[PDB]
Amino acid sequence: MQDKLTSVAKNCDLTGSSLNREVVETLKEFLADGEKRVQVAGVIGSNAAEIVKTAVSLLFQEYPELVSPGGNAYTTRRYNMYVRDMNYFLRYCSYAIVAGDASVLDERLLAGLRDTFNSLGIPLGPTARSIQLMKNIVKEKLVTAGMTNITFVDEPFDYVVREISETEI
């Protein structure tokens, strides 16, 4: 996996344009938000359990059939698996927020995720909904902490959804 700086530096040699003006501008823009990325990751790590618990409770509110008999969140075994996987998603999204690059998600979260979920019958719609709920809760916590320009926080979660959701149109 790579972070933003590593990918940009390697692309500098790959593309043959070296350290031109556009690369310098993108590097400066990225470095301007680095402290905010670290702060966002700190907030996510300090409130991980609360975020996951809130998101899973809201998911079971919006999908009451999940916890009913025959549902996928039926029994504490599957409930614990739900919580565990949502923690996985939150952890790797925090990693991607720090790195500024989505390669960590590609290599350690999304590679083979669809195969696993098809094998185990894990529904993807509720998975995307839970990721979006976690994203909303993280945004609420960041607004509470006083952060202002936190658009990049949307990038991992949304991206993950786009990678796991099926094609409808």
Ligand X SMILES: *[C@H](C)[C@H]1/C(=C/c2[nH]c(/C=C3N=C(/C=C4\NC(=O)C(CC)=C4C)C(C)=C\3CCC(=O)O)c(CCC(=O)O)c2C)NC(=O)[C@@H]1C
Residue partners of 166: CB distance under 8 A and separation at least 6 = 124
Output the DSSP codes for 54-73: HHHHHHHHH-GGGSSTTSTT
Phi first, then psi, for residue 72 (nearest 5°) are -85, -15
Report d(CA 123, CA 139) in Å as an integer. 25
Which of 128, 137, 138, 150: binder of another protein (CB under 8 A)?
128
Report d(CA 159, CA 164) in Å as an integer. 9
Residues within the annotated binding site?
Answer: 72, 77-78, 84-85
Stretch that binds another protein, among 31-39, 40-48, 122-130, 142-150 (CB under 8 A): 122-130
Q: Is residue 127 part of the contact set for ligand X (CB under 6 A)? A: yes
Min dist. Cβ of residue 150 to another protein (A): 12
Q: Is residue 23 part of the contact set for another protein (CB under 8 A)? A: no
Report d(CA 11, CA 2) in Å as an integer. 12
Of 112 and 146, the one with the shorter C-beta distance to ligand X is 112
Of 44 and 157, the one with the shorter C-beta distance to another protein is 157
User: Residue 122 in 3-state DSSP?
Assistant: coil
Min dist. Cβ of residue 135 to another protein (A): 8
Of 33 and 158, the one with the shorter C-beta distance to ligand X is 158
Min dist. Cβ of residue 85 to ligand X (A): 3
Which of 3, 33, 155, 158: binder of another protein (CB under 8 A)?
158
Report d(CA 109, CA 101) in Å as an integer. 13
CB 2 within 8 A of CB 108: no
Binding partner of 82, given another protein, ligand X, none, CB within 5-8 angstroms per partner class? ligand X
Of 35 and 111, the one with the shorter C-beta distance to another protein is 111
Q: Is residue 79 part of the contact set for another protein (CB under 8 A)? A: yes
